[PDB]
């Protein structure tokens, strides 16, 4: 039911998901001047060398690249995190034009897109239990700006023609998500939520400071996807981002001095 349009988008979600107006909603604007270095953060560990990708799915809202999370392969640890968080999927949010598309903003600046690598805390056994816990999930967020092509993204771009419409999927084995990272792991972190319904307040957000560059041609192919199913009137999959939400009683901490 929910979506991104005038009649079912972010301003309507609260009617079926009242937590939309909650105390730790995401995304937020990251005021870089107010964010404070936190010496209590431990080194961040992104351990993706044994990742096992499986499938890419157009879910009608974005596309998800899904991973085998049946044991610790790709995991995120350290930083603000207590315990091991297993990678389950990644997806993006993007705009109709380069000047918008990110969910988080940096001193109010919107990036062209934002990558979310989604992980669940293994002490809760399964994703469904994890989303009943305040520390159930960790999402690693990475901004995309338009410039040079990102070679590690091209395999994703080139399969999108095969999943144009809602409900289509394709095999997507042997994809290495390490090729989507920037050089630096400097980050900001804060407690928040899922950015789509059901908007559950379970997420430790870790948002990298350094964007990745992707080419205009790469993001233009994201914008050829469809929200609609096969045979239905074409609705381009663009502007699938939620705007920044009130920070409320939170502080954004920085990993860097």
Ligand X SMILES: NS(=O)(=O)c1cc(F)ccc1F
Ligand Y SMILES: OC[C@H]1O[C@H](O)[C@H](O)[C@@H](O)[C@@H]1O
Ligand Z SMILES: OC[C@H]1O[C@@H](O)[C@H](O)[C@@H](O)[C@@H]1O
Give yes or no for residue 50 binding ligand Z (CB under 6 A): yes
Specify whether the CB–CB gap between 150 and 219 falls below 8 A.
no
Give yes or no for residue 245 binding ligand X (CB under 6 A): no
Tally DSSP H helices, then E strands, for the chain: 3, 15
- Interaction pattern, residues 71-110, with ligand Y; x per rule: CB under 6 A: ----------------------------------------
Count other C-beta atoms under 10 Å from residue 234's C-beta. Answer: 11
Q: Report the residue number, 16 or 171, with the smaller CB distance to ligand X.
A: 16
Give yes or no for residue 162 binding ligand Y (CB under 6 A): no
Query: Contact with ligand Z (CB under 6 A): which of 17, 22, 51, 215?
Result: 51
- Residue 145 and residue 166: Cα distance in Å, rounded? 26
33 known ligand binder: no
Give yes or no for residue 45 binding ligand Z (CB under 6 A): no
Q: Where does residue 14 rank: exposed (0-12), middle (13-18), buried (19+ CB within 10 A)?
A: middle
Q: Which stretch binds Zn ion (CB under 5 A): 16-24, 27-35, 77-85, 114-122?
A: 114-122
User: Taking CB under 6 A as the criterion, which residues in 59-118 touch ligand X?
Assistant: 116, 118
Query: Contact with ligand X (CB under 6 A): which of 81, 139, 140, 181?
Result: 139
Tell me the closest approach of the beta carbon of residue 129 to Zn ion, in angstroms.
Answer: 20
Specify whether the CB–CB gap between 115 and 141 falls below 8 A.
yes
Beta partners for 226?
Answer: 236
Give yes or no for residue 151 binding ligand Y (CB under 6 A): no
- Residue burial 24-50, b: 16+ Cβ < 10 Å; e: rest: bbbbbbbeeeebeebeebeebebbbee
**Is 12 an active-site residue?**
no
Count other C-beta atoms under 10 Å from residue 168's C-beta. Answer: 17
Q: Which does 251 bind (CB under 5 to 8 A by kind): ligand Z, ligand X, ligand Y, none?
A: ligand Z
Give yes or no for residue 48 binding ligand Y (CB under 6 A): no
Tell me the closest approach of the beta carbon of residue 51 to ligand Z, in angstroms.
Answer: 5
* DSSP state string for 173-227: -S--GGGG--S---EEEEEE--SSTT--S-EEEEEESSPEEE-HHHHHHHTT-BS
Kindly list the residues in this chain that would bind ligand Z in the complex (CB under 6 A).
Answer: 36, 49-52, 174-176, 251
The residues assigned a catalytic role are 61
């Amino acid at each position: 039911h929910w979506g991104y349009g005038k009649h079912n988008g972010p301003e309507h979600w609260h009617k079926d998901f009242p937590i939309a107006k909650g105390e730790r909603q995401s995304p937020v604007d990251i005021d870089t001047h107010t964010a404070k270095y936190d010496p209590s953060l431990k080194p961040l560990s992104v351990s993706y060398d044994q990742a096992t990708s499986l499938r890419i799915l157009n879910n009608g809202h974005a596309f998800n690249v899904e991973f085998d999370d049946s044991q610790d392969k790709a995991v995120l640890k350290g930083g603000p995190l207590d315990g091991t968080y297993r990678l389950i999927q990644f997806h993006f949010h993007w705009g109709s034009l380069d000047g918008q598309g990110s969910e988080h903003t940096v001193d109010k600046k919107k990036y062209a897109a934002e990558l979310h690598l989604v992980h669940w805390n293994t002490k809760y056994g399964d994703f469904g239990k994890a989303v009943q816990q305040p520390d159930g999930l960790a999402v690693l967020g990475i901004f995309l700006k338009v410039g040079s092509a990102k070679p590690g993204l091209q395999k994703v771009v080139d399969v999108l023609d095969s999943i144009k419409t809602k409900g289509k999927s394709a095999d997507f084995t042997n994809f290495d998500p390490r090729g989507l990272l920037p050089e630096s792991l400097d980050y900001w972190t804060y407690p928040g939520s899922l950015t789509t319904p059901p908007l559950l307040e379970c997420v430790t957000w870790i948002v990298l400071k350094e964007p990745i560059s992707v080419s205009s041609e790469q993001v233009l192919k994201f914008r050829k996807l469809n929200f609609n199913g096969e045979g239905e009137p074409e609705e381009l999959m663009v502007d699938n981002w939620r705007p920044a939400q009130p920070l409320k009683n939170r502080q954004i901490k920085a990993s860097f001095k």
